[PDB]
Amino acid sequence: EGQVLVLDGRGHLLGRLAAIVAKQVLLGRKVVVVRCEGINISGNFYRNKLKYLAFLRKRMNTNPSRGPYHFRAPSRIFWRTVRGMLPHKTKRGQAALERLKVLDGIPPPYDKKKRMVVPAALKVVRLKPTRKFAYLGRLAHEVGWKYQAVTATLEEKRKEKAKMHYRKKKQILRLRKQAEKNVEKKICKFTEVLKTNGLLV
Amino acid sequence: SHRKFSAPRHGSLGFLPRKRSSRHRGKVKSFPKDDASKPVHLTAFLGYKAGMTHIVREVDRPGSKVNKKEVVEAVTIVETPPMVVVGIVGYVETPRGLRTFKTVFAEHISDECKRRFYKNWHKSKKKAFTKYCKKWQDDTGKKQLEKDFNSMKKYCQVIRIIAHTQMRLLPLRQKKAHLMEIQVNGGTVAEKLDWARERLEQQVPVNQVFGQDEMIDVIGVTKGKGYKGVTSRWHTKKLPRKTHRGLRKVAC
Amino acid sequence: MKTILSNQTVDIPENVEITLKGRTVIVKGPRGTLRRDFNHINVELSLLGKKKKRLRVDKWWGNRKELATVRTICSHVQNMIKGVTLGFRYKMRSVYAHFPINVVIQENGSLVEIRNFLGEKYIRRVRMRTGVACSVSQAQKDELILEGNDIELVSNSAALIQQATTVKNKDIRKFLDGIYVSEKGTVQQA
Amino acid sequence: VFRRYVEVGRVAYISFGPHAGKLVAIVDVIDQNRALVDGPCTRVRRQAMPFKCMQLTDFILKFPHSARQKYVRKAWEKADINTKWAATRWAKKIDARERKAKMTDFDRFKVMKAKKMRNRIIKTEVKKLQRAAILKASP
Amino acid sequence: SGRLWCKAIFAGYKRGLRNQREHTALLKIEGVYARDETEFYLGKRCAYVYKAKNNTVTPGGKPNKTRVIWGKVTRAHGNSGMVRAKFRSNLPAKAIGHRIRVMLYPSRI
Amino acid sequence: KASGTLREYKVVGRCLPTPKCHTPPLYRMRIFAPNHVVAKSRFWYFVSQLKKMKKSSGEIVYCGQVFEKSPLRVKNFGIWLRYDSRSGTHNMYREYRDLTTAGAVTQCYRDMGARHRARAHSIQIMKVEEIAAGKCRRPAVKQFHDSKIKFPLPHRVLRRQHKPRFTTKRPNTFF
RNA sequence: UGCGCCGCGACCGGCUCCGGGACGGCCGGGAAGGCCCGGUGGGGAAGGUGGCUCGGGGGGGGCUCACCCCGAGUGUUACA
RNA sequence: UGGAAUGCGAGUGCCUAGUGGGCCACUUUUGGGAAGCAGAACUGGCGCUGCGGGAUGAACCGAACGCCGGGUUAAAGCGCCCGAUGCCGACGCUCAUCAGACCCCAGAAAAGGUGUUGGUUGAUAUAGACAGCAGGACCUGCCGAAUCAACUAGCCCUGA
RNA sequence: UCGAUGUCGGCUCUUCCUAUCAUUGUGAAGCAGAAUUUACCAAGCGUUGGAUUGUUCACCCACUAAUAGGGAACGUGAGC
RNA sequence: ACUGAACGCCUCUAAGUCAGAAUCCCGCCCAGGCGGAACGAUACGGCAGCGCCGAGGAGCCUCGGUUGGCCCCGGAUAGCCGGGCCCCGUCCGUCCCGGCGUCGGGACCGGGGUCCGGUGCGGAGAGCCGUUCGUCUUGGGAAACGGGGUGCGGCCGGAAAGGGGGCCGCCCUCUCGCCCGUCACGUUGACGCACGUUCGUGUGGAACCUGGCGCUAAACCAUUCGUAGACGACCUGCUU
């Protein structure tokens, strides 16, 4: 499709999701990635923590304020992995990068929207079940991310409200089943047309 | 090659930018951690450095050579007239940090506090808060104030008071009050707001913030000394007498 | 080599009810209830029989490394069975040459205060795991008793106090001071 | 926890091979990846097929391993696997998915008219049951 | 009453890694993600519709700001549904990542 | 040599007739090669190191493909081979289950490359025979000698990735 | 001989990349495979069916009788 | 009967500039521990030469060049940067708290591992194997089917 | 690199390495205690004042927890 | 070190746990993004500017893109999804005595269970919603507890990053719309042809006229101060 592609980052693998997002954003699509703290990386946590600490050591020793900037929020960590997949020193790469929006948690614009999933980047698909993995949220917290408890309480409040919305949706759905039985005599012809054509069989 | 003899570096990089402070008033960068079980109290105050003198007291540390003996100790006197509460600020916790949610000001604000809102009080018409105050009197405005306190009650995690010093009582040329946010600690957000509301426009003496023989933190701006060489700024070793083109500098 | 099927069975006594919520095992017995998650092991758990129930663990197409988890799960479940029927009781003894080891129990067996270990004035306070009670024995002069249902909780508590009374900067071969686990058994014998 | 099993007699559905959409019977297991299969009543001759291309069904035939085609055929006809398969919900979904893919432009127009009228009647009844539910809950 | 063209995206020019041939453009057509699905679109007319500042004559209409570069789909590209197209004038580079219409006009079905 | 899916070739050759020997003996080998051109080259490789017969002094009397006699019957195959490692040469006996003799040999070349990094040029296959189930020796092959073989397919990886490439539903792998 | 400018179509020819349909030759004059309950046949085993024996687990009627489902042997077509 | 095959049109004179520092690679080879060291043979190359690939690079791999349109390849590639596997690719191996990841080429050895996977040789075990429960002091009884040893070579790990 | 890359040492100052002298946490001993030796994680912190010599190096005197070793164009001359 | 296989014993390791440091990361402290927020005041008085009512339109220039929407469970994956029934806790409103009694029921969730359906997901993103040639004469279905009016108000709607819909009353539009027929036409039947068909009353700018309600300020310089300072900058004072 098109419009804005909203991706739920939970359960995905970092680089495999980044490669797909980088190509979509180069193709002109606007992409939103939410819940970057739920992104997984292959390999045990300690090995992945060592990788980030080696990254932290890289720094211009004459003036580290000029040096490479080590963003600690998981959304900015994901933003930098996509950045390494883009020609970000050209105007085309910059414009594509501006089409990417990354978020920790699910802020107001996007919980009341349906999120998409990329099966080619899901951990349940691409990792063997016996292989160890890390959580970007925990890894970010151990290297200096300040807001993991706060994002956790806001996530919990969101999941409570999403749960009430889903029960109302379920009650509507079961009312619609009862409505179907009630008006079966007066909708039988229209149902017959649908069944013959592959809908409602 | 290596340094012949080791010596620790001169100065600290923990105060690295070593520039003029962007603020004249000292800033509280971390308030004491909130404990809801404790009663409602303030956490900071504003004073003025008057001078230094020395006192005589007898110490009570048993194993010391000065135990039960009279000692002379230098002290500093900080003049602290009472502060006037003029506002309340609410904050919400977000995954991007603490964000200012809503601030409410008192009905009558003194002229010395209004002076902080102007760079040229002489040329001003003194119109600051002249429309805001009318909201405290109008019936529609009163309802909005109550709704605004209720939203702060159910959404804010941090509550602060805007308070200013009274410069009428000080022997200073300056007449413009210093404004400050002072965090309210203890209790619940509802109890903090009720405490704040009732002493809005009121006076808080320093004895209700600090007590005797307690250990406090002092925040301020250091005495200015202008442009300085590396010998005074960083306390480097002076070069020998027979040095060409300068002694008070770092050689390499 | 991937073996097609590796299976093992645990017999459930008559005093114990085992319920399976997927790979979550709930064992209920006269002394209480124990819960344990096995979501980190990809095996299938089944309950067999109406009377004389059994727990069967299956692993399909497993390599050598993951065939070793079949008996590990079975042994753990046999531990929770004995935990809810007999309980776990670990007895410890204080060994000293000159300075007696004084042990005082606080908070109904939850806090252990050890004084005068090797004669020093630092008081060691060891906190037992939840569900583990520490007692001072009346049968022997200087012996502690840890009791509980979870074998891992009881033995971790014993390890906490054994490593608390550790000798530093001296030949550990000669001084030999400390509290050591003497025997592992059950609260009731059957 | 498992119900479907690769076993001799298990009927499987082919997903993506050259024989996609057929039913076969497992005659023998060559190894962990390949099984000897036979489709005597479904126009699939005996051959080796990977397990990756087959989706197991509920039907299990009764014949010994490596049995020849005539015994696989007798079992298939006795159990009437062709008619039992067509009666399942799995096959009904397949046939509905194929006929929707064959819908013409005129059939698309007629489905539009039927769906438009149908949803109006259902929506009216759903609202009536909403009002009944809210009135009964809060009289 | 509705759209009569298929949505395509100008992905880039036909190129190697370090040589770009600008007389051929590469297109990604929505819903076509395999080589075997690109057969329908072969020979189809494609249009790059854009807007400028000055008015230009419109066939069957009044002058407006819409300008078009015409082309046709020449052949498939890769085995992932991408196609290549030849436009009467080489496409501007500012159009990369933007919409190109495939008009269904020369019809074989 | 290289490999595709190998075929079996019966290659019969001999030396050219000479005044010393008017009727030289005929020699036969079974060669597993991608095509008949490689089969003839492989014949000359072995017969030259066995019988002192070079291609220039001989001829290929016959070269045809040996079809599998029971391609619908599951069999066990024993392979006797010798291969060159980085240090030394070794003799190995291996087992495979297959429907065809050629397929079993192709399995062996893949398995030697997988487990020993042995390339095809470093492998000599000297015997391939069909073994009864009772005379098999490797546990990997013996576990399929079970008349009631029965196993599930536990954790099926979704192989149709990128077909939607963006979906609302997360995949289920239980089946 | 050329359109003022912007375009469209048709058939013919050249090069080229593809898609359908149909015909035949050769091999071990292919290897297999299928049907005739093939025959009234002859042998051999096990990844051994039925039967028999031993142990186990779920059924019924009332803890005997018993209906299944397993495991282990023995055994060469019987109820595969 | 133009006395093997194949290919090709040959012969010849005068005048003649620049050059007469070379360098690199497969193989062979001398001195040197060795060297991006010094010195040789043969062929090709760089120098005189751009082009595709090796990220980058005189010499490597491919291929040599008038200005262009279509088609196809070489060497090399096809997650994203970046054209091309978005194949429902095939069989295995391997987890690294310094993993590995492609000629020249840009970093590792001897020696080791009860990590795991293959393979070779020998041996035990119905009279009864190896475990474990103990006794006498190598034998026994109880559990009752595979086990023990040496070696070898793949990936991974120590050596680092 | 010869139509010029200022040259020994010291002084001054920063940063880096670890093949660790001390200090934090440990393992081993021919570890009784004290003292010491061997090894592991480990370079955060510290590693001095002087007589002689232009010296690097060396040597001695004296404190010290220790008085470890090195690099940065054999760091650093429009800094001396 | 714990539990514990591999390897019937053993084992700190394989899965799963524990204690652990001058190291590491954060805090405390210093700075504060071509990074945000809340609040205040927003232009003389007779010449004017400015703000709100999506203000009401009519038009112009400019920058371009795009050419139906999906308003949402949490998640597991060696398992899941949907429906009524039991147990443990919660909630509203009807009588009884604002508050009580399960006084009874309906309507409810959260947890643990139990059954009944579904599971190559069909209560399905291989999906769903909407789906527009326009009017006219008139029939049959459906609806007539409906359509619309930012109509007018009223209630409940919400803070992670103000966007908010549903319900109630009174009017008019009233059964016209939605499905299948019938009847008669078309300012385009423009005589084969491209940029058509939307978002959209788009972003930004300036201006014209008309109607209401509103507003009448600061910043800098200059002058002072010395808590500051090379110069800038900074801290201050100037009818109370």
Curated annotation (Swiss-Prot), chain A:
Statement: the UniProt record of this protein carries the keyword Protein biosynthesis: no
PANTHER family listed in its UniProt record: LARGE RIBOSOMAL SUBUNIT PROTEIN UL13, RIBOSOMAL PROTEIN L13
Q: Which gene encodes it?
A: Rpl13a
The signal peptide stretch is: none
- Origin organism of this chain? Mus musculus
Single GO BP term: homeostatic process
Q: Where in the cell is it found?
A: Cytoplasm
What post-translational modification does the entry describe?
Answer: Phosphorylation at Ser-75 upon interferon-gamma treatment in macrophages involves a DAPK1-DAPK3 kinase cascade and is causing release from the ribosome, association with the GAIT complex and subsequent involvement in transcript-selective translation inhibition. Citrullinated by PADI4.
On this chain, the residues bearing Phosphoserine are S75
Task of the protein: Associated with ribosomes but is not required for canonical ribosome function and has extra-ribosomal functions. Component of the GAIT (gamma interferon-activated inhibitor of translation) complex which mediates interferon-gamma-induced transcript-selective translation inhibition in inflammation processes. Upon interferon-gamma activation and subsequent phosphorylation dissociates from the ribosome and assembles into the GAIT complex which binds to stem loop-containing GAIT elements in the 3'-UTR of diverse inflammatory mRNAs (such as ceruplasmin) and suppresses their translation.
Question: Which NCBIfam families does this chain map to?
Answer: L13_A_E
Under InterPro entries, the record lists: Ribosomal_uL13, Ribosomal_uL13_CS, Ribosomal_uL13_euk/arc, Ribosomal_uL13_sf
Q: What is this protein called?
A: Large ribosomal subunit protein uL13
The UniProt record lists the keyword Hydrolase: no
From Swiss-Prot, chain B:
User: Which terms does the record give in the GO molecular function aspect?
Assistant: structural constituent of ribosome
User: Which organism is this entry from?
Assistant: Mus musculus
**Where is there biased composition of kind Basic residues?**
17-30
Keyword Transmembrane listed? The answer is no
Name recorded for this polypeptide: Large ribosomal subunit protein uL3
Q: What does this protein do?
A: Component of the large ribosomal subunit. The ribosome is a large ribonucleoprotein complex responsible for the synthesis of proteins in the cell.
Signal peptide span per the entry?
none
**Modification Phosphoserine occurs at:** S12
Positions of modified residues (Tele-methylhistidine)? H244
Q: Which residues of the full protein are shown?
A: 2 to 253 of 403
From Swiss-Prot, chain E:
Q: Which UniProt keywords apply?
A: Acetylation, Cytoplasm, Ribonucleoprotein, Ribosomal protein
Q: Where are the transmembrane segments?
A: none
Compartments, as annotated in UniProt: Cytoplasm
Molecular function (Gene Ontology), one example? structural constituent of ribosome
Gene Ontology terms describing biological process? cytoplasmic translation; ribosomal large subunit biogenesis; rRNA processing; translation at postsynapse; translation at presynapse
Task: Tell me the residues on which N6-acetyllysine occurs.
Answer: K7, K62
Any one cellular-component term (Gene Ontology): cytosol
Q: Which superkingdom, per the lineage?
A: Eukaryota
Residues the record lists as N6-succinyllysine modifications: K62
What InterPro entries does the record point to? Ribosomal_eL33 (IPR001780), Ribosomal_eL33_CS (IPR018266), Ribosomal_eL33_sf (IPR038661), Transl_B-barrel_sf (IPR009000)
UniProt keyword Coiled coil, yes or no: no
Record function comment = Component of the large ribosomal subunit. The ribosome is a large ribonucleoprotein complex responsible for the synthesis of proteins in the cell. Required for the proliferation and viability of hematopoietic cells.
Oligomeric and partner information: Component of the large ribosomal subunit.
Q: Which HAMAP family match?
A: Ribosomal_eL33 (MF_00573)
Instruction: Provide the family line.
Output: Belongs to the eukaryotic ribosomal protein eL33 family.
Q: What is this protein called?
A: Large ribosomal subunit protein eL33
Q: Which source organism does the UniProt entry give?
A: Mus musculus (Mouse)
Q: What is the lineage of its organism?
A: Eukaryota, Metazoa, Chordata, Craniata, Vertebrata
UniProtKB/Swiss-Prot annotation, chain F:
Q: Which residues carry this modification: N6-succinyllysine?
A: K75
Query: Which residues does the record list as Phosphoserine (modified residue)?
Result: S70, S122
Mind telling me which Gene3D superfamilies this protein's record contains? 3.10.20.10
Modified positions (Phosphotyrosine) are Y62
User: Pfam families, from UniProt?
Assistant: Ribosomal_L18A
**UniProt keyword annotations, A-Z:** Cytoplasm, Isopeptide bond, Phosphoprotein, Ribonucleoprotein, Ribosomal protein, Ubl conjugation
Output a single Gene Ontology CC term carried by this record: cytoplasm
Subcellular localization is given as: Cytoplasm
Example GO molecular function term? Answer: structural constituent of ribosome
Q: Which GO terms describe its biological process?
A: cytoplasmic translation
The record, for HAMAP family, names: Ribosomal_eL20
Protein family: Belongs to the eukaryotic ribosomal protein eL20 family.
Q: How does it assemble?
A: Component of the large ribosomal subunit. Binds IPO9 with high affinity.
Q: What is this protein called?
A: Large ribosomal subunit protein eL20
Please tell me the species this chain comes from.
Mus musculus (Mouse)
